[PDB]
């Protein structure tokens, strides 16, 4: 979807507590599973995926990092 939509969707799951605009491993999992079951681009887990992504979002995934994930998925 467009950045606007990806942002909206991201925020839907990121807007909990602690940080309202970063998906934790939990919220990343929840987002992926709920919104993108068709695109579970992980493995026999998503730990590795998480570690691969989080070279930035301090144990979570910022919007940029997520949009980059979507970019990767799309590619």
Domain ranges of the chain: 1-75
Integer-rounded Cα radius of gyration of the chain = 11
Handedness of CA 34, 38, 39, 42 (dihedral sign): positive
Beta bridge partners of 62: 22
C-alpha to C-alpha distances, 1 to 9, 47, 52, 57, 74, nearest whole angstrom: 10, 25, 23, 22, 10
**Neighbouring C-beta atoms of residue 61, cutoff 10 Å:** 27
CATH homologous superfamily of 1-75? EF-hand (1.10.238.10)
Of 45, 53, 15, nearest to 31 by C-alpha is 15
Helix (H, G, I), strand (E, B) or coil at 32: helix
Experimental method: NMR
Give Cα 27 distance to the centre of its chain: 7
**Neighbouring C-beta atoms of residue 22, cutoff 10 Å:** 22
- Tell me if 53 sits within 8 A of 67, measured CB to CB: no
Is 58 annotated as a binding-site member?
yes
Helix (H, G, I), strand (E, B) or coil at 43: strand
Is 27 annotated as a binding-site member?
yes
Is 4 annotated as a binding-site member?
no
- Tell me if 9 sits within 8 A of 1, measured CB to CB: yes
Is 56 annotated as a binding-site member?
yes
């Amino acid at each position: 979807k467009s950045p606007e939509e990806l942002k909206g969707i991201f925020e839907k799951y990121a807007a909990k507590e602690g940080d309202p605009n970063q998906l934790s491993k939990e919220e990343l999992k929840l987002l992926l599973q709920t919104e993108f079951p068709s695109l579970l681009k992980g493995g026999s887990t998503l730990d590795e995926l998480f570690e691969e992504l989080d070279k930035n979002g301090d144990g979570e995934v910022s919007f940029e990092e997520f949009q980059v994930l979507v970019k990767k998925i799309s590619q």
